[PDB]
Ligand binder design. Structure first.
Ligand code: HEM
Ligand SMILES: [Ca+2]
Ligand SMILES: [Ca+2]
Length: 345
């Protein structure tokens, strides 16, 4: 343990340089510490860097990808052209100059920016940050990042190969869709959120994906898109099916009205994702650099039905426990506002 020049204690004096990186990204990437487009894009970038590993491919003498190696940045012209990585070159290009200026590894930076991004979102867990990711030497193969039109079987199998993650852990990692929008699936409109609170790390994603889908927020006929339950909200087929599948439905529902489980499980699974490709015992704990997460503001219940929705609108899929009869916000059904992204998204 060491004390940095700012008086903060950290796991190791090598962590102290990350306070310079923190100040720089908070002002110049996240527009003063916001949980907006760049924050959401950085959270997604962690998954797409890290899940690109495959012990199964390696066991046939094929490169399976290095996991959290910064390969999606170092080899951006290759990986960001893969279909599942659509729209990520925009955030890669915004991140690159910080990596160059601060002399940090591309994989460490991607993990850092994802943790800082989440710390900006009220309700987020206290996010971890470990260092020790050598620069990738090969780009990832394609076919390693899940698609919204993939089956539940293949997504379960994919995350079990990548990280020995089981079907329950697949549900936890999809909590990231609580602070997320879709730029590229609907060719007519960018920035359609997955839940009605894309600035808030909460279980609205788990509530709202359980509702009956009533309309497309924009165009119909988009591969891997299904009807959503609110105007301005997007829903993808993978989320819709995982929420109703007999293996995962009860786990999905368990996050409704359970902030502690949402926060504790996502803290765990995020750190696990950021260690793919690495020996955790070789890494340095710089978690004390990450800002203290903020609580959800206001005095409303943690989970709620959006205005215009009640228990009658829930497609209850959990045979163990009934979907909880939440409160319904007052007034007319309200449109979820789009989050316009930076150019090239
Ligand atoms: C496992 C199956 C998953 C599928 C099929 C999936 C699919 C999607 C799709 C289709 C989008 C919109 C992408 C675009 O339009 O460019 C998206 C956005 C996003 N995903 Fe996922 N995802 C998955 C898992 C995860 C995980 C595990 C995380 C993070 C831990 C994550 C974080 C995000 C975030 C933050 C966004 C929003 C990006 C933005 O606001 O620009 N996703 N996801
Ligand atoms: Ca990678
Ligand atoms: Ca949310």
């Amino acid at each position: 343990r060491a004390t940095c020049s700012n008086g903060k204690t950290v796991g190791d004096a090598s962590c102290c340089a990350w306070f310079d990186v923190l100040d720089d990204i908070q002002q110049n990437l996240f527009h003063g510490g916001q949980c907006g487009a760049e924050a959401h894009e950085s959270i997604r970038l962690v998954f797409h860097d890290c899940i690109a590993i495959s012990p199964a491919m390696e066991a046939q003498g094929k490169f399976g990808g290095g996991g959290c190696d910064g390969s999606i940045m170092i080899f951006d012209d290759i990986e960001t052209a893969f279909h599942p990585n659509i729209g990520l070159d925009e955030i890669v290009k915004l991140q690159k100059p910080f990596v160059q200026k601060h002399g940090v590894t591309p994989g460490d930076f991607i993990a850092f920016a994802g943790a800082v991004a989440l710390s900006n979102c009220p309700g987020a867990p206290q996010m971890n940050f470990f260092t020790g990711r050598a620069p990738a030497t090969q780009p990832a193969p394609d076919g390693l990042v899940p698609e919204p039109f993939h089956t539940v079987d293949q997504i379960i199998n994919r995350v079990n190969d990548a990280g020995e993650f089981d079907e329950l852990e697949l549900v936890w990692m999809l909590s990231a869709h609580s602070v997320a929008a879709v730029n590229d699936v609907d060719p007519t409109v960018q920035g359609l959120p997955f839940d009605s609170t894309p600035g808030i790390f909460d279980s609205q994603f788990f509530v709202e994906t359980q509702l009956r889908g009533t309309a497309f927020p924009g165009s119909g006929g988009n591969q891997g898109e299904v009807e959503s339950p609110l105007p301005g909200e997007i829903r993808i087929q993978s989320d819709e099916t995982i929420a109703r599948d007999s293996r995962t439905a009860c786990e999905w529902q368990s996050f409704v009205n359970n902030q502690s489980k949402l926060v504790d499980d996502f803290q765990f699974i995020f750190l696990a994702l950021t260690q793919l490709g690495q020996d955790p015992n070789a890494m340095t704990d710089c978690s004390d650099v990450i800002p203290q997460s903020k609580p959800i503001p206001g005095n409303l219940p943690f989970s709620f039905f959006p205005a215009g929705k009640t228990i009658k609108d829930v497609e209850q899929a959990c045979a163990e426990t009934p979907f909880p009869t939440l409160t319904t916000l007052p007034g007319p059904e309200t449109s979820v506002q789009r989050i316009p992204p930076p150019p090239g998204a």
